Copies of this chain bind each other. A is one copy, B any other.
Amino acid sequence: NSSIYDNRNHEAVRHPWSTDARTFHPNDNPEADRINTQYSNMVSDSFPEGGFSDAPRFSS
């Protein structure tokens, strides 16, 4: 969760299934020189390229 008008801000999203609650941290203090300014390197500052680690494996 992201908004400051949420009580569980900067906290992992709760699902019916068990999921690792360690969160993706966006780049809040990036370095001045970011030699690669392509989308490949920019997207990693706000999302993970491999997707989130919250996926389920359903027993049924």
Residues on A close to B: CB < 8 A?
Answer: 14, 16, 18, 59-60
Contacts and interface: CB of A to CB of B under 8 A. Distances in A.
Nearest to A18: B16
Interface of A is mostly: loop
Contacts of A60: 59
Chain copies in complex: 2
A3 B60 CA distance: 38
A18 to B, nearest CB: 4
Nearest to A59: B59
A60 B60 CA distance: 10
Contacts of A59: 59-60
A11 to B, nearest CB: 11
